[PDB]
Design a protein around this ligand. Structure first.
Ligand SMILES: Nc1ncnc2c1ncn2[C@@H]1O[C@H](CSCC[C@H](N)C(=O)O)[C@@H](O)[C@H]1O
Ligand SMILES: Nc1ncnc2c1ncn2[C@@H]1O[C@H](CSCC[C@H](N)C(=O)O)[C@@H](O)[C@H]1O
Ligand SMILES: [Zn+2]
Lengths: 27, 46, 181, 99, 155, 171, 397, 51, 408, 49
């Protein structure tokens, strides 16, 4: 669970990087 | 010696001379070229 | 009978090796009253050190460091750690753009004859045998001391940094000998 | 934790009034321990005094070579932290619990 | 290709009227470095220095150290014209003009060393009304010192 | 000279009710003290607007300069009519009188909203022939945000031991 | 973040402290006259590189004293040699002087100055006693710096219950007074010309002894050699900045904390620009070639790159070595880049282009290594108690 | 081929739209604004002279 | 005889000062306390001693050799931010004699307010330096002042100045350098043109206002539309994403959560630059080091995140006790125009047993069972035998280091 | 290149707002693509009108 803590830390550009949009991600 | 704000500044130790030359042009390659071909006839300037 | 020079004498001891023979040009000491009548043959001085002696030798240290700083950009740069089994062998970043590997011996071996006026305890401090034994990589090494069996490493055009080591052996061979496939 | 008892020992009293919790005891031990013990100046001589002590005992014909070896040694040695650095290192360590 | 010594040689061999283009030609040395401007004033003639500051007054914002180095170069030229014996002394009018340009650019920000250098430059010309005016100007700005009185009595 | 021509070339930029001026004042001959011209503009315009919106400095012996950084329409012509009034009143003090003048407005550039207002004057030879120093540099400095150095760091004071008594009386 | 900045400073603290002391030891040796009066620190997350630059160039104005017995406190700078001379003179009077006549002047003048205050009459009958007064003023100023080192805080004199002196409360006439000590070559005047004619006078060892044994001119040589007045630190992340401010504000006063490096900011010229462990941390979106070219144009003096010894970091440092050496033949010769340390040849590095480094990863990094006494954090996270830790660094001066 | 194989149609449409939008923004910002500085100059430049 | 004067600028001619927030409520807070009554009892003890030795009176009912003369009863106060000097002037005027004020500020423009106070009384009662409030412990040490007053935010001098920023309704392009002193770096025009979208959101969320749904909308408008010539193009972009700015400007009497997103962005961007989260957290925790035993600390709070920081520090610091919190009087909001949410937090220091007072109200059963686990598992342990830990001890000197101070 | 080329050597007054920085980000030894140039605007003929 320690790796998911840095997901709110990355910049918005290379955040969703295998997909172009962030709307159709898992929420 | 006065200075006007658009004059040619000649550096010290050097003096400018005027040379009047002529060549045929058919025998020469011409004057100086900027970029030469990459990858007999000489330039007149050299 | 050695005449003072600043040109190293290159003795080719084989293919890709040679021998750098140059000598570090000893200077006379200062003639102040604290250097005079120094007991050299005793080596066990018990004379009281006045603070005037320590301030005189402080100015002599600044004079000697100012002399050694003028030759400092002409020195070598120890880049790999020296190995010490009797001899001291390291790698050097020369001020010519070359990577050499030289050896430093403890005892004296001149360029013409072995006869000298130094002991083994003297020349181990003169020729940098005590120096190169105690220093690691990233420090200076003098060019004025003689270097034995200096071999220049081969050079390529492209940098070997950020190169993959998972290439095959016959293309790593072609890459290191400057003729890539 | 009653304030009369020490922290490493354990109090035998069962009362609640006039006592702090161990989360609060860990706060005041991280808070109150900011000071450095006084460095003895006269106990350890300076490094310039120690090298000039050794240069007086050397032969004056050999003094030029000891300066060259001392200049060419670019390593300061084992770099211990200065007390200005040790105060800043513990200032970050005392702002949060060890866990 | 060129160093600062060759640039100083080009400045010291060129005439005074050529102080304006070369300053505008190599202005990368003067636009941000007051140390380079002080070194380039201290290494040339005083007339080339006042020509350089007259060229730089329309482009940059010169500091008090610039006029301080200019008055120092003028005092050194006075010393050289005392010691050697040829050439003319620095005129008092150029010293008063430099001090007036410094006091109009920087008001009450110049040191009293500027006034001391101005009095030492007005001393060999024996211009005493200039010394009286400088004393009145320095007394009006609440800075009146004793070496200024010494140099004004020398004037 | 017997006549005096003053050519002013504005550079205007308009973005929906604001203006942005850049006036390069240029005289016709040498001898006109433009340091006294600019200090008339600087005293007049400091009471009206702050120096964060405009600058004014000398670029030549016969040329000056003045800008304005994107203020409203009522504020911008307030500055230009104050500059062009201190322009003539400085030249009236030289011994001249305004004979004729005209103004020219240029259209926009083909991709930007930039105009050029050419304003020209013509004078003629009319006149037959212990104050307070207010010191300011030629090229002004920008006061953006707080001051880096304190207020007393600009002025210089002598030491107290070197101070002398005043030999002129001060009332 | 600030939780990552705690673990970055507690784990890499002594490692980056030793890596910066290794580079400043060579910089003080190779360039002895350099005093960085203004300092820029690019990527100053934690202020370790600013703290060592305070320790190297100003060991006397710190809050806590340095351990004087270490080799790391023997620098070659003019400000460091001035502070080492005072600590050496303390060891000379304590150890190399067996006569207690130094004590006899001290306890008499303590007893003399105490009894003339309220019991004995005035000092007017005793003539030529200015040797007592000018020492007691100098001994009083020695007491002022004594209480700063005991309290580890400057401006402690206003904390005490002594009365504040009337006149100049704000510090206006002390910061704006004309110094009579700075005299440029033209402001000197009207002296005996034999002093300016006879050159080469102080070449004797006796006249050098009186040059160092007096301390009135040493303070005059230190007020001109102001080591660190304005320091500029650059850090974008707020987690590193609020912890880098906690490190620096106790020992390095008046440090300006910029948040971003602008292309506008290269008009400010600093004496020393330190990019310590910051070239590798630049993201791939930002052009690293523009940043290291901007950092060179902000240097009056020395530009220092310090990085960890790694394969990716050495390629960054060698590219930055090639990008700045590309700026050689652009203009004035006196402002061209020179490599002071480590590589002295200014060609391509032979270890970067060696034959052996193709298939051997060990023969690729032209680096050095610094040794340090590791803390409890590093011996907890590495599971082995290392009383001497090893930090390998690649540097470029 | 794995990165277009993973993406859907609307994701590739959003990628192409953001690429063209950032491209035209970069082109209009390098055609309108020059010399970097991360700020427009806010003032017309002073008049240059022939030197 | 020519007197030289520097010409005044428009920010210097039309300079306005800051109004007094509260004068009688501050003087009971920053002066009154246990440090004040034993001071006032020491003045009465010295008055009856003066008539005992034989000094001339009135009929009425009752370190070293250079600095042997030390001062009497005087009550030393530190002002971290003096601003216009009204809060610094109320201590020295209403306190009469035996009081002192040391004033600090970030801006050098507060030297004008420091100059006007010395002309009334100075040299021995006022002292000024130019530094941050977080650098106070580094230049005064522990247990230095009998009282410390802390203000926060922007003065009215810096608000109306067009060169200092903070102008919203001027209708002209000025540079948005909105910072309190030169000790900080870039201003808001240079910040918003260089900050990324992720770094701007993480800096806005630290101050409580403009939460994650609102902070990402304001950061989208900045990072997509940033050719920023002046403040006017910024204020059009800010008011286009959120609502328009209120008519009160920076001082809005409305609710905190009901304020528009434009005011929440500008009030937090002011806090991002000068770093008021770090300056107030370190300004409070250093003040409890610099205070004497049973001293007084006064901190003014005008923002809801500041109310969390003052409340959050006094509950965890093992010397701080909140004496009382006073809100602003309703008459000072009309004539002076202050924020209605302005509170005054008067914090006192404890000599010992500060947690015994706080365990009276805040002690739950789950905190009692957590305290049993931390003693059993030993989570209150620190470090003693490590390398930097062996050189650290408490404030009282040991027997090993008293011998060190004899020779040093 | 002729439309953007300044005639002769020209310098102006310097202030802290106008900088013209050397912040290029590429090599100084290459000059291909570094000249100031206008975009070619050809007006329409009367047939196009
Ligand atoms: N592009 C960039 N511009 C400026 N700073 C950057 C940067 N990229 C990373 N940094 C900062 O540089 C820091 C490097 S960590 C190094 C900390 C400090 N220099 C020391 O040696 O003690 C990081 O905290 C990061 O925030
Ligand atoms: N962190 C800080 N440290 C010191 N001064 C600060 C500061 N933050 C703001 N200031 C200063 O405090 C002033 C506003 S405080 C406002 C009220 C004023 N101090 C008074 O007592 O009446 C500003 O001028 C600013 O320069
Ligand atoms: Zn190398």
């Amino acid at each position: 669970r320690w790796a998911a803590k840095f997901y709110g830390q990355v910049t918005f550009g290379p955040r969703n990087y295998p997909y172009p949009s962030s709307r159709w991600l898992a929420r | 010696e006065l200075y006007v704000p658009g004059q040619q500044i000649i550096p010290p130790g050097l003096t400018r001379y005027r040379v009047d030359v002529q060549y045929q042009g058919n025998d020469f390659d011409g004057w100086w070229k900027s970029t030469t071909r990459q990858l007999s006839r000489y330039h007149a300037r050299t | 009978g050695h005449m003072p020079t600043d040109v190293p004498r290159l003795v080719k001891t084989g293919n890709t090796r040679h021998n750098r023979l140059i000598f570090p040009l000893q200077f006379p000491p200062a003639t102040h009253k604290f250097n005079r009548a120094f007991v050299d043959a005793g080596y066990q001085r018990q004379r009281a050190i006045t603070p005037a002696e320590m301030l005189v030798v402080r100015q002599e240290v600044e004079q000697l460091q100012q002399r050694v700083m003028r030759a400092a950009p002409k020195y070598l740069r120890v880049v790999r750690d020296p190995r010490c089994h009797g001899k001291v062998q390291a790698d050097f970043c020369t001020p010519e753009g070359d990577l050499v590997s030289g050896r430093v011996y403890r005892r004296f071996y001149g360029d013409r004859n072995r006869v000298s006026a130094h002991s083994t305890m003297r020349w181990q401090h003169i020729g940098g045998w005590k120096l190169l034994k105690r220093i690691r990589r990233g420090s200076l090494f003098p060019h004025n001391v003689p270097l034995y069996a200096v071999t220049k490493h081969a050079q390529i055009d492209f940098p070997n940094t950020l190169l993959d080591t998972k290439h095959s052996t016959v293309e790593q061979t072609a890459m290191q000998y400057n003729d890539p496939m | 934790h009653k304030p009369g008892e020490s922290g490493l020992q354990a109090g035998s009293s069962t009362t609640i009034a006039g006592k702090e919790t161990w989360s609060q005891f860990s706060t005041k031990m991280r808070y109150g321990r900011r000071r450095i013990r006084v460095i003895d100046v006269a106990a350890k001589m300076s490094y310039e005094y120690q090298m000039l002590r050794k240069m007086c005992k050397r032969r004056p014909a050999m003094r030029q070579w000891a300066v060259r070896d001392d200049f060419c040694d670019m390593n300061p040695g084992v770099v211990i932290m200065s007390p200005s650095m040790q105060a800043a290192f513990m200032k970050v360590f005392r702002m949060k619990e060890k866990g | 290709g060129y160093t600062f010594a060759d640039f100083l040689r080009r400045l010291e061999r060129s005439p005074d009227s050529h102080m304006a283009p070369l300053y505008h030609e190599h202005r990368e040395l003067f636009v941000r470095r007051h140390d380079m401007f002080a070194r380039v004033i201290s290494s040339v003639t005083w007339s080339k220095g006042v020509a350089l500051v007259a060229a730089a007054g329309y482009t940059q914002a010169v500091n008090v150290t610039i006029y301080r180095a200019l008055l120092a170069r003028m005092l050194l030229h006075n010393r050289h014209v005392r010691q050697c014996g040829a050439g003319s002394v620095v005129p008092w009018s150029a010293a008063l003009r430099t001090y007036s340009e410094a006091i109009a650019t920087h008001g009450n920000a110049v040191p009293t060393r500027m006034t001391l250098s101005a009095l030492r430059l007005c001393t060999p010309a024996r211009q005493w009304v200039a010394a009286i005016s400088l004393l009145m100007l320095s007394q009006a700005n609440d800075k009146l010192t004793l070496p200024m009185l010494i140099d004004a009595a020398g004037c | 000279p017997d006549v005096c021509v003053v050519q002013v070339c504005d550079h205007m930029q308009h973005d929906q009710g604001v203006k942005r001026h850049a006036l390069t004042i240029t005289y016709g001959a040498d001898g006109f003290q433009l340091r006294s011209l600019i200090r008339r503009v600087r005293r007049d315009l400091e009471r009206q607007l702050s120096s964060t919106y405009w600058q004014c400095y000398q670029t030549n012996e016969r040329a000056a300069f003045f800008v304005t950084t994107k203020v409203a329409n009522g504020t911008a012509d307030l500055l230009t009519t104050s500059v062009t009034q201190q322009l003539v009143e400085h030249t009236e003090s030289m011994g001249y009188s305004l004979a004729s003048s005209y103004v020219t407005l240029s259209p926009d550039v083909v991709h930007t909203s930039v105009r050029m207002l050419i304003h020209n004057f013509t004078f003629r030879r009319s006149r037959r022939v212990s104050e307070t120093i207010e010191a300011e540099p030629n090229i002004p400095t920008m006061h953006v945000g707080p001051r880096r150095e304190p207020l007393n760091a600009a002025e210089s004071i002598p030491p107290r031991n070197e101070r002398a008594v005043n030999i002129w009386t001060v009332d | 973040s600030t939780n990552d900045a705690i673990g970055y400073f507690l784990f890499r603290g002594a490692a980056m402290y030793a890596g910066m002391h290794r580079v400043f030891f060579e910089l003080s040796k190779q360039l002895p006259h350099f005093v960085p009066k203004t300092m820029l620190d690019f990527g100053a997350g934690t202020g370790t590189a600013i703290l060592v630059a305070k320790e190297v160039y100003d060991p006397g104005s710190l809050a806590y004293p340095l351990y004087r017995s270490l080799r790391q406190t023997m620098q070659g700078n003019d400000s460091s040699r001035t502070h080492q001379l005072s600590e050496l003179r303390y060891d000379l009077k304590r150890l190399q002087r067996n006569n207690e006549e130094k004590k006899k002047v001290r306890f008499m003048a303590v007893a003399a100055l105490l009894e003339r205050g309220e019991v004995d009459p005035a000092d007017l009958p005793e003539d030529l006693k200015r040797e007592i007064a000018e020492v007691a003023t100098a001994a009083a100023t020695a007491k002022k710096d004594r209480l700063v080192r005991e309290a580890h805080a400057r401006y402690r004199d206003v904390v005490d219950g002594t009365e504040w002196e009337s006149g100049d409360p704000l510090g206006e006439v002390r910061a704006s007074t004309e110094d009579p000590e700075d005299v440029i070559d033209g402001e000197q005047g009207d002296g005996g010309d034999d002093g300016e004619a006879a050159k080469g006078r102080p070449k004797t060892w006796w006249e050098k002894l009186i040059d160092v044994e007096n301390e009135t001119a040493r303070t005059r040589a230190a007020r001109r050699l102001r080591p660190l007045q304005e320091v500029t630190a650059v850090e974008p992340s707020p987690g590193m900045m609020e912890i880098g401010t906690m490190v620096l504000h106790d020992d390095v006063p008046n440090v300006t904390w910029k948040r971003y490096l602008l292309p506008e900011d290269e008009a400010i010229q600093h004496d020393l620009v330190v990019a310590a462990y910051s070239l590798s941390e630049i993201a791939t979106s930002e052009n690293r070639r523009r940043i290291v070219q901007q950092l060179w144009k902000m240097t009056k003096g020395v530009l220092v790159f310090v990085e960890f010894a790694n394969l990716n970091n050495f390629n960054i440092l060698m590219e930055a070595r090639d990008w700045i050496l590309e700026e050689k033949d652009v203009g004035l010769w006196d402002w061209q880049p020179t490599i002071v340390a480590p590589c002295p040849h200014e060609h391509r590095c032979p270890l970067r282009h060696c034959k052996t480094g193709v298939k051997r990863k060990r023969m690729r990094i032209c680096s050095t290594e610094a040794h340090y006494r590791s803390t409890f954090v590093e011996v907890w996270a590495r599971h082995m108690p290392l009383k001497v830790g090893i930090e390998p660094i690649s540097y470029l001066i | 081929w794995f990165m277009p194989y993973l993406w859907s149609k609307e994701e590739k449409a959003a990628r192409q739209k953001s690429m063209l939008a950032d491209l035209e923004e970069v082109e209009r910002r390098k055609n309108e604004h020059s010399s970097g500085r991360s700020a427009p100059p806010r003032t017309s430049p002073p008049p240059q002279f022939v030197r | 005889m020519k007197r030289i004067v520097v010409p005044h600028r428009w920010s210097e001619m039309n300079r306005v000062e800051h109004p007094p927030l509260m004068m009688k409520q501050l003087f009971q807070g920053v002066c009154g306390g246990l440090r004040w009554l034993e001071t006032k009892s020491l003045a009465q003890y010295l008055a009856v001693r003066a008539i005992e030795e034989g000094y001339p009176s009135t009929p009425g009912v009752r370190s070293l050799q250079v600095t042997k003369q030390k001062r009497l009863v005087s009550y030393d106060v530190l002002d971290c931010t003096l601003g216009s000097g009204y809060h610094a002037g109320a201590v020295l005027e209403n306190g009469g004699p035996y009081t002192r004020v040391v004033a600090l500020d970030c801006d050098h423009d507060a030297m004008h307010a420091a100059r006007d106070l010395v002309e009334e009384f100075g040299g021995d009662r006022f002292r000024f330096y130019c530094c941050k409030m977080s650098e106070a412990k580094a230049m005064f040490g522990e247990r230095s002042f009998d009282a410390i007053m802390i203000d926060g935010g922007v003065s009215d001098t810096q608000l109306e100045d067009p060169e200092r920023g903070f102008l919203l309704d001027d209708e002209g392009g000025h540079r948005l350098d909105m910072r309190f002193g030169p000790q900080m770096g870039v201003g808001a025009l240079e910040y918003l043109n260089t900050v990324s979208q992720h770094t701007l959101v993480s800096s806005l969320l630290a101050y409580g206002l403009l939460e994650y749904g609102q902070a990402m909308k304001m950061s989208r408008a900045i990072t997509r539309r940033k050719p920023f010539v002046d403040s006017r193009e910024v204020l059009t972009c800010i008011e286009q994403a959120g609502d328009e700015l209120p008519e009160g400007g920076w001082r809005s009497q409305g609710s905190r959560r009901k304020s528009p997103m434009s005011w929440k962005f500008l009030t937090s961007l002011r806090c991002i630059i000068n770093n008021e989260m770090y300056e107030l957290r370190q300004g409070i925790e250093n003040a409890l080091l610099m205070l004497r035993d049973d001293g007084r600390l006064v901190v003014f709070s005008r923002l809801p995140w500041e109310e969390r920081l003052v409340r959050g520090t006094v509950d965890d610091h093992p010397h701080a006790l909140l004496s009382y919190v006073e809100d602003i009087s309703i008459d000072d909001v009309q004539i002076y125009g202050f924020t209605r949410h302005a509170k005054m937090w008067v914090i006192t220091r404890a000599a010992s047993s500060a947690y015994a007072l706080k365990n009276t109200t805040t002690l739950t059963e789950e905190k009692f069972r957590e305290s049993s686990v931390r003693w059993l598992t030993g989570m209150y342990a620190g470090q003693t035998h490590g390398f930097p830990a062996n050189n650290f001890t408490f404030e009282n000197f040991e027997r090993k280091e008293w011998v060190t101070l004899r020779r040093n | 290149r002729a439309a953007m080329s300044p005639g002769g050597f020209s310098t102006g007054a310097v202030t802290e707002e106008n900088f013209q920085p050397k912040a290029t980000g590429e090599s100084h030894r290459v000059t291909r693509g570094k000249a100031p140039k206008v975009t070619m605007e050809k007006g329409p003929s009367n047939l196009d009108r």
